[PDB]
Amino acid sequence: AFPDCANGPLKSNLVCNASADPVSRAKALVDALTLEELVNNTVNASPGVPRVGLPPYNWWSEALHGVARSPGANFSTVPGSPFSSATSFPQPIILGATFDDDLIHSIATVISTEARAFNNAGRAGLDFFTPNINPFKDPRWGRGQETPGEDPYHIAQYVYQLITGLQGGLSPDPYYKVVADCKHFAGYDLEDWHGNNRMAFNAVISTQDLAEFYTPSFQSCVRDAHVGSVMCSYNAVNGVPSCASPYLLQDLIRDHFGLGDGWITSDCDAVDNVFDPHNYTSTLVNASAVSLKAGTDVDCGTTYSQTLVDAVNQKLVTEDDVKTSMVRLYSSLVRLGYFDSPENQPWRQLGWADVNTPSAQALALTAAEEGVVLLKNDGTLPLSRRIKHIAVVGPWANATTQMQGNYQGIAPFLISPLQALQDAGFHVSFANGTAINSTDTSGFASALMAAKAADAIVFAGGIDETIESEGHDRDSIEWPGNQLDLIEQLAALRKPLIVLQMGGGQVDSSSLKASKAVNALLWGGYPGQSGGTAIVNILTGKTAPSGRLPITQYPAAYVDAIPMTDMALRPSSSSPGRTYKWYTGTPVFDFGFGLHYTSFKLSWAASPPSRFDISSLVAGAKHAGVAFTDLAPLFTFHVAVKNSGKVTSDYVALLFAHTTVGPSPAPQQELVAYTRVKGITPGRTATAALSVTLGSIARVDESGVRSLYPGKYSVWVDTTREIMHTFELTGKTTQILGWPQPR
Ligand SMILES: *[C@@H]1O[C@H](CO)[C@@H](O)[C@H](O)[C@H]1NC(C)=O
Ligand SMILES: *[C@@H]1O[C@H](CO)[C@@H](O)[C@H](O)[C@H]1NC(C)=O
Ligand SMILES: *[C@@H]1O[C@H](CO)[C@@H](O)[C@H](O)[C@H]1NC(C)=O
Ligand SMILES: *[C@@H]1O[C@H](CO)[C@@H](O)[C@H](O)[C@H]1NC(C)=O
Ligand SMILES: *[C@@H]1O[C@H](CO)[C@@H](O)[C@H](O)[C@H]1NC(C)=O
Ligand SMILES: *[C@@H]1O[C@H](CO)[C@@H](O)[C@H](O)[C@H]1NC(C)=O
Ligand SMILES: *[C@@H]1O[C@H](CO)[C@@H](O)[C@H](O)[C@H]1NC(C)=O
Ligand SMILES: *[C@@H]1O[C@H](CO)[C@@H](O)[C@H](O)[C@H]1NC(C)=O
């Protein structure tokens, strides 16, 4: 329900005055309320205040890749009825594999539209706990499937697009569409590995790594995209739980990244964890108190509503702290149109007709088609047209709900690889074969019989929610169970053999890489509701592959070279380094790697520049139309991409940078720019524009300070160093962005 501002008990409170300042309306609502009532509404499952006609409002809604199940979400229980389903896009890991920022904005628009409709039905809030922008740093993380990948720059671009699409522009022009929430702020990328439970874990993070790896995405989300909400993390960073750290919430989130009057929710009773099990405060009241003074405005739990009155009476917090939090929450609601009449709000008109739109379904399909990565191919793909009888085998072959990952809703449909092969007209012999993770070989003979007479074999396997999930990290990053044994037995048949490696995290597929009998390999992640159709469109050649790995495929032994608790990224006395930036070993498949159905010849469309003076770049930063010096340009490369093959294809141009100047050691590579060139027909030459910022090229020192250093720099335009360029910066080392030193 919404408050009645025409006739309800608040119709003369300034909150119901539609032309008034939002913060003034929030202050008028808060000032008319009892301290005890305000404390009552410091939690996600807020009762409202019946005395003033303020209805209940639940802050906990989920929409990570489409409207999702949550305490605040209500799917209809009649399967064909209104609000019985919503568009279930692929997991953000495949979305990040697309490297298509525009597509991310479109997907965010669809999600916000459907969420608005559900809220108009009383089946969702106006306020969703998305996105997850913690880098998928360690390959074992059970929640990395929820993220765009392991590169902070890529995550930053992704999250800019997603926040602006979800909230409706860079500002509430009339209103917020929905209020997004970039979540788990501060060093959270671990579930329960080796008994290190997230709710008791202490992330020891250097200042350099905090500023260089763990927070740039929050820069983009909070400072550049103007998110209206941040969620503070379960864990501790350097001894202080996130939600009770005023250095993190005030100095970094609100001040450095400019959240301002935007509100901060805890993770779901992380305030409770500040007491138990973090043992940071010796009482629950003091846990609530220090979390509130640090900057946690609303508690995803009942701890605040049970303790904050005690905390005011014990002088641990003031009534004004509670009032400030409440003003933040209600100001956000005011900017959402909560206290405005629905007559002039188009977003208050969206209904069930606006959910599973033909265009939204096509968009989910397009996302899956651009995200799937072709890891290996010898020409077998796209499938020969004489291929007719196909055996589909594996614990993912007929995957329906598996394709949705976690944090999902109810989809209108789930098109499995099996069904999409049947939709395409193939004569299919299906066999489970074996489970995701078991020692039972009973199904092997059945799969062999399915494959014995076939024209081609499609094995679909990997990991899923039973292997990686919130609260469960992986111990091994190998294929689970005996899946590889069955793939080997199928390869013995020496037929055309295609292997679909699914799941969010990567598994060691090097054995498949080295086998001549495995003719093709694709990573399908969690591909969403139309995943099978996308995969089969790729297999048949109806759509050409173009997706690229958003994370590294590590060799299995990586799990023995570094513990998951090691928050450092640089190589060390005990670490081979983390991510493509620092890993000293040999990935099975590199970050950004991907194959196409055609060849590309790359050259310079404009002659690239050779030298820059640092003071000149800093001076010109003031005169480019950007809000902060780190957002101003270094340059824009123009690359010509000739389709030298015979098949129309997209191409993701990825610009990597390396340097030896400034702080040592330097990363091996950093992704500084990328762009998706669409629909290059055979013979044509398309031009890709690659814009690098001063912030992407500036180095972070031991203090978290980001500066421009004068030295020699190089750039290249694929993982295969497809063209290459050297330039040089000259002048004084000059600071581009400061860093608040830890309290
Ligand atoms: C809202 O307040 C302004 C002054 O702040 C006043 O001019 C206007 O009439 C008020 N509108 C309503 C609907 O009360
Ligand atoms: C706080 O909420 C509880 C549960 O709805 C209710 O019993 C109590 O009266 C509320 N307190 C005030 C001051 O409204
Ligand atoms: C929506 O939720 C309410 C309770 O929150 C429940 O009574 C109702 O049945 C739900 N809607 C449907 C269609 O089941
Ligand atoms: C909590 O920490 C205090 C010191 O900060 C210590 O004395 C106490 O034993 C700890 N209690 C628990 C339950 O961990
Ligand atoms: C509450 O916790 C903080 C930080 O642990 C501590 O400094 C403070 O003394 C505690 N308050 C009380 C009343 O014990
Ligand atoms: C494929 O999965 C669906 C569940 O979504 C099931 O109804 C169907 O029977 C399965 N097909 C086969 C051949 O197992
Ligand atoms: C395939 O797998 C599921 C296990 O989740 C099983 O219940 C199903 O009946 C199997 N299908 C066949 C045709 O044996
Ligand atoms: C597979 O199951 C076994 C037994 O439950 C377990 O020890 C192993 O960790 C599982 N594999 C994965 C990758 O989770």
Q: Which residues, 6+ apart, have CB-to-CB distance to 267 below 8 Å? A: 183, 184, 231, 232, 233, 234, 243, 300
Verify whether residue 267 is a known catalytic residue.
yes
Task: Assess whether 495 and 620 both reside in one domain.
Answer: no
Residue from 88, 392, 396, 398 whose mutation best tests the ligand 6 pocket (most atoms within 8 A of CB): 398
Ligand closest to CA 13: 1
Amino acid at position 179, single letter: V
Q: In what order do the strands lie in the sheet with 670-680?
A: 611-613, 724-730, 712-716, 649-659, 670-680
This structure's resolution (angstroms)?
2.5
**What's the rounded Cα separation, in Å, for the pair 326 and 317?**
14
- Nearest ligand to the CA of 122 is 3
Identify the residue whose C-alpha is closest to ligand 8 atom 9: 475
Could you say which of 100, 138, 251, 267 is catalytic? 267
| Ligand 8 pocket check for 467: Cβ under 6 Å | yes
Nearest ligand, CA 241: 5
Task: Please tell me the distance from the alpha carbon of residue 375 to that of residue 373, in angstroms, as a whole number.
Answer: 6
SS3 17: coil
Q: Cis peptide before 131, with omega less than 30 degrees from 0?
A: yes
**Residue 305 CA to ligand 5 centre (angstroms):** 20
User: Do residues 329 and 30 make contact, with C-beta atoms less than 8 angstroms apart?
Assistant: no
Q: Do the bridges between strand 600-604 and strand 633-643 make them parallel or antiparallel, or are there none, so unpaired?
A: antiparallel
> Are both 478 and 542 inside the same structural domain?
yes
DSSP calls for 95-158: HHHHT-HHHHHHHHHHHHHHHHHHHHTTSS-SB----B-S---STT-TTGGGSS-S-HHHHHHH
324 is a domain residue: yes
* Residue 591 in domain: no
Give CA–CA dist 323/65, Å, rounded.
34
Helix (H) or strand (E) holding 420: helix 417-423
What phi and psi, each to the nearest 5 degrees, are found at residue 295? 145, 5
Label residue 507 exposed, middle or buried (CB < 10 Å: 0-12, 13-18, 19+): buried
- Same domain for 380 and 504? yes
Radius of gyration (Cα) for the chain, nearest Å? 26
Q: Do residue 106 and residue 63 come from a single domain?
A: yes
Closest-CA residue to 654 (of 696, 597, 610, 609): 696
Give, as one character, the DSSP assignment of residue 253: I
620 & 667 share domain? yes
Any domain includes 593 = no
Q: Is residue 574 part of a domain?
A: no
Clarify whether residues 319 and 368 are in a common domain.
no
Region of residue 433 (phi > 0: left; psi between -120 and 50: alpha; otherwise: beta) = left
Please indicate, yes or no, whether residues 166 and 302 belong to a single structural domain of this protein.
yes
Residues 322 and 239 in one domain: yes
In a domain, 164, yes or no: yes
Q: How is residue 57 written in tokens? A: 């409002």
In ligand 3, which atom is closest to the CA atom of 81?
Answer: 13
Which distant-in-sequence residues (6+ apart) come within 8 Å of 547 by Cβ?
94, 97, 98, 99, 370, 371, 372, 373, 374, 523, 594, 652
SS3 assignment for 517-551: CCCEEEEEECCCCCHHHHHHHHHHCCCCCCECCCC
**Atom of ligand 8 lying closest to residue 463 CA:** 13
Query: Which residue among 316, 332, 353 closes a domain?
Result: 353
Which residues are CB-neighbours of 528 under 8 A, at least 6 positions away?
65, 88, 89, 90, 91, 94, 364, 367, 368, 403, 404, 411
DSSP 8-state assignment for residue 250? I
Q: Which of the listed residues 70, 74, 118, 410 should we mutate to test ligand 3's pocket, taking the one with most ligand atoms within 8 A of CB?
A: 74
Q: Across the strands, what pairs with 673?
A: 655
CA-to-CA separations, 35 to 29, 296, 319, 343, 501, in angstroms, rounded: 12, 18, 7, 33, 55
**Residue that finishes a domain, picked among 296, 321, 353:** 353
Is position 68 within any domain? yes
Distance 469 CA to ligand 3 centre (A): 28
Q: Ligand 6 centre and the CA of 532: distance in Å?
A: 13
Write down which residue in 534, 560, 586 finishes a domain: 560
Chain-centroid distance, C-alpha 98: 12
Q: Residues with Cβ within 6 A of ligand 1? A: 17, 19-20
What is the count of structural domains for the chain? 3
567 found inside a domain: no
Q: What angle do CA 644, 646, 648 make, to 5 degrees?
A: 90
**Quick one: 349 and 359 in the same domain?**
no
Which CATH number is 670's domain given?
A: 2.60.40.10
CA–CA distance, 397 with 461 (Å, rounded to integer): 7
Residue 595 near residue 375 (C-beta atoms within 8 A): yes
* Burial degree of 691 (CB within 10 A; 0-12, 13-18, 19+): middle
CATH number at residue 126: 3.20.20.300
Which ligand minimizes its atom distance to the CA of 420? 6
Within 13 A of 441's CA, how many CA atoms are on the CB side?
9
Residues 307/40, Cβ–Cβ less than 8 Å: no
Query: What is the residue-wise DSSP string for 41-105?
Result: TSBSEE--BGGGTB--EE---B-BTBSB--TT----SSTTSTTS----PPPHHHHHHHT-HHHHH
Both structure tokens of 555: 């060799």
* Calpha distance 579→564 (Å, rounded): 13
| Residue 25: φ, ψ to 5° | -60, -45
Identify the DSSP state of 555. Answer: -
Distance CA 105, CA 90 (A): 14
Q: Which atom of ligand 6 is nearest to the CA of 401?
A: 5
User: How many angstroms separate the CA atoms of 454 and 434, rounded?
Assistant: 19
84 and 214 housed in the same domain: yes
Residue 580 lies in a domain: no
Query: What phi and psi values does residue 425 have, to the nearest 5 degrees?
Result: 100, 10
Q: How far apart are CA 519 and CA 497, in angstroms?
A: 6
Cα 562 versus chain centre, distance: 24
> Which atom of ligand 6 is the closest one to the Cα of 419?
1
The identity of residue 708, as a single letter, is L
In this structure, which residue's CA is closest to atom 11 in ligand 2?
37
Range of the domain at 693: 600-737
Q: What is the CATH number of the domain that holds 374?
A: 3.40.50.1700
Is the beta carbon of 476 within 6 A of some atom in ligand 8? yes
544 with 679, same domain: the answer is no
Q: Are strands 236-237 and 202-203 parallel, antiparallel or unpaired?
A: parallel
Q: How was this structure determined?
A: X-ray
Are both 325 and 358 inside the same structural domain? no
